[PDB]
C-alpha cells in the first residue's frame, strides 16, 4: 500500500492526507499574473514552487489538470496604459508575451489552461446574477455591485480572522462602473468591469467544476483575495469551493520587504542576468516553500557553489531506495530541506564510487539523481557546459 502525500492546508493550519475528489485526478487552480509589468522574483518564487508541486504530483502518477489565469482586466493595467499613452489592450497583450518568455526562461511547465479574464465575462455575469438572486450581492448607491460580507458567516475562516455606497466597510466590489474613456463590458447593471476576485471565482469553477482539489497562490493573496473567492463561490454556487489551499511563502530582498515604495523590486529578467536559472531555482526551492526567504548575493552564491559540487560529481560519467526516501521527504508537505540533503547524500556516494573507480555504480546513481533533480528543474545541463 503506497504512502500518501500530506500537504499543509491553509484552511485548517495543518498537514492533511491529500485525498483527490476523483480518484487519481487532481484539479489545480493557481492565481497568475496581472499583465501590466514584468514579473518580479516574488512571482518567480510562486511560479517555481507550484511548478515543483505539479511536477511532483505527476511524478507520483496523478493526472493533474493545471490551470493558471491571466488577469488582463485590472485598474493597474488601465493606469499603466495611460502613463505610456497606449491602449490598455495593447499593454496587456505586450506583457502577456513578456510573461510567456519569462516563464519559458524559468523552464516552468505550461498550464493545461491559461484563461484570461477578458474571455470569461459572461461566466462572471452569471455568477454575480446568482449572488444578487441569493441576496449575497446588492446595488449599490453609486451603481456598483457589492458583496455583502456580513451575510456570509464563514467569512474570514481561510485567514482565521474574526472582525478585521457600501452597507459595510468590509464589503467588496463585484462589478464596478467604467470611467469615461475606459474599456468596459455591458451587463444588466450598467457598463463596467468585474472586480478582481469574482474573476478567479468564475474562471476556476467554470473550468474545473466546483468544488475542486487545490487552489494556490502567493501568501499575500490569502486575504482579501482568496478569502473573497471563497465567499463568492460558496454563496454563489451553494457548494464547497476548494478542498485544499496552498500558499507560497514570501520573498524578501536583503531581509527587507519587497516594496514598490522602497524601490527594491527585482524583475525576473534582472535576476536572470545575474544568475543562471538553475542557480535561481536552487535558491528558491532549497528552503521550505511556506517559509519566508531572503534574496541576496550571498544566498545566490551559496546555491551556485552547491550546484558546482553537483555538476563536478556528474562531469565525466557515462549517460534504488533513494527514490523511496525522496518520496518520503516530498510526501511530508514538500519538505525540500530533507529532499535536498538527500540529493547531497547521493552526491557523496557518487564521489565515493568515482574515487574508488567503480564507474558503473557512479553512473547508475547519477542517472537516478538527475531524475529526482528534474522535479526542481536542476541537474539538466551537460556538466561540461555548466563548468
Ligand atoms: Zn486570483
Report the separation in Å between the CA atom of 151 and the middle of ligand 1, taken as the mean of its atom positions: 22
6-9 and 145-147 beta bridge pairing: unpaired
Whether residue 260 is annotated as binding a ligand: the answer is: yes
Rounded-to-5 percentages of helix, strand, coil across the chain: 45, 15, 35
By the 8 A CB rule, do 81 and 91 touch?
yes
Q: How far apart are CA 267 and CA 42, in angstroms?
A: 9
200 is in an annotated binding site: yes
**160 alpha carbon – ligand 1 mean position (Å):** 19
Which residues are registered as beta bridge partners of 30? Answer: 68, 216
Residue 128 CB neighbours (<10 A):
25
**DSSP conformational letter for 144:** -
Using the mean position of ligand 1's atoms as its centre, give its distance from the Cα of residue 31 in Å: 4
Largest CA-CA distance found in the chain, in angstroms, rounded = 81
- 200 CA to centre of ligand 1 in angstroms: 5
C-alpha distances in Å from residue 218, one per residue of 42, 75, 103, 221: 8, 20, 17, 6
Instruction: Provide the H-helix boundaries in the chain.
Output: 41-59, 75-83, 88-106, 121-134, 196-208, 227-237, 268-274, 277-286, 297-314, 321-330, 336-355, 359-373, 383-386
For residue 248, how far is its CA from the centre of ligand 1 (angstroms)? 14
Cα-to-centroid distance, 217 and ligand 1 (Å): 8
Tell me the C-alpha to C-alpha distance, in Å, between residue 199 and each of 21, 67, 168, 352: 24, 14, 22, 55
Q: How far is the CA of 75 from the centre of ligand 1 (A)?
A: 15
Is residue 371 a known part of a binding site? no
- Distance (Å, rounded) from C-alpha 103 to C-alpha 114? 13
- Taking alpha carbons only, the member of 274, 334, 335, 326 closest to residue 303 is 274
Cell representation of residue 161: 480572522
- Residue 295's DSSP bridge partners are 253
Please report the resolution in angstroms. Answer: 2.3
The verdict on whether residue 191 carries a ligand-binding annotation is no
**Distance between Cα 303 and ligand 1 center (Å):** 31
What structural domains does the chain harbor? 20-296 (3.40.50.620), 297-377 (1.20.120.640)
- Output DSSP code: residue 166: -
In the numeric block, which cell numbers belong to residue 97?
A: 508575451
225 is in an annotated binding site: yes
Amino acid at each position: 500500500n503506497a504512502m500518501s502525500v500530506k500537504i499543509f492546508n491553509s484552511l485548517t493550519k495543518q498537514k492533511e492526507i491529500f485525498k483527490p475528489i476523483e480518484s487519481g485526478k487532481v484539479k489545480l487552480y493557481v492565481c497568475g499574473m496581472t499583465v501590466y509589468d514584468y514579473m518580479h522574483i516574488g512571482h518567480g518564487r510562486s511560479w517555481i514552487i507550484f511548478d515543483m508541486v505539479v511536477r511532483y504530483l505527476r511524478m507520483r502518477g496523478y493526472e493533474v489538470t493545471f490551470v493558471r489565469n491571466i488577469t488582463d482586466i485590472d485598474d493597474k493595467i488601465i493606469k499603466r496604459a495611460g502613463e505610456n499613452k497606449e491602449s490598455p489592450a495593447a499593454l496587456a497583450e505586450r506583457f502577456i508575451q513578456i510573461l510567456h518568455e519569462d516563464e519559458k526562461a524559468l523552464r516552468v511547465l505550461s498550464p493545461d489552461q491559461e484563461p484570461r479574464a477578458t474571455q470569461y465575462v459572461p461566466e462572471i455575469i452569471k455568477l454575480i446574477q446568482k449572488l444578487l438572486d441569493n441576496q449575497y450581492a446588492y446595488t449599490g448607491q453609486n451603481g456598483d455591485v457589492f458583496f455583502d460580507v456580513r451575510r456570509f458567516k464563514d467569512y474570514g475562516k481561510l485567514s482565521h480572522r474574526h472582525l478585521d455606497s457600501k452597507r459595510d466597510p468590509l464589503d467588496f466590489v463585484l462589478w464596478k462602473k467604467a470611467k469615461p474613456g475606459e474599456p468596459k463590458w455591458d451587463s444588466p447593471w450598467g457598463e463596467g468591469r468585474p472586480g478582481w476576485h469574482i474573476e478567479c471565482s468564475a474562471m476556476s469553477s467554470s473550468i474545473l467544476g466546483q468544488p475542486f482539489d487545490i487552489h494556490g497562490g502567493g501568501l499575500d493573496l490569502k486575504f482579501p483575495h482568496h478569502e473573497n473567492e471563497i465567499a463568492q463561490s460558496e454563496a454563489g454556487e451553494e457548494k464547497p469551493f476548494v478542498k485544499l489551499w496552498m500558499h507560497a511563502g514570501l520573498l524578501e530582498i536583503n531581509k527587507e520587504k519587497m516594496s514598490k515604495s522602497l524601490g527594491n523590486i527585482i524583475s525576473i529578467r534582472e535576476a536572470l542576468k545575474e544568475s543562471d536559472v538553475e542557480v535561481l531555482r536552487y535558491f528558491l526551492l532549497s528552503g521550505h516553500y511556506r517559509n519566508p526567504l531572503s534574496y541576496s548575493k550571498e544566498n545566490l552564491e551559496n546555491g551556485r557553489l552547491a550546484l558546482e559540487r553537483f555538476y563536478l560529481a556528474l562531469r565525466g560519467l557515462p549517460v534504488s531506495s533513494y527514490t523511496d526516501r525522496f518520496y518520503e521527504a516530498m510526501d511530508d508537505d514538500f519538505n525540500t530541506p530533507i529532499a535536498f540533503a538527500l540529493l547531497f547524500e547521493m552526491v557523496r556516494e557518487i564521489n565515493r564510487f568515482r574515487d574508488n573507480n567503480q564507474i558503473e555504480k557512479a553512473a547508475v546513481l547519477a542517472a537516478e539523481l538527475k531524475c529526482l533533480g528534474n522535479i526542481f528543474g536542476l541537474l539538466q545541463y551537460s556538466p561540461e557546459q555548466f563548468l
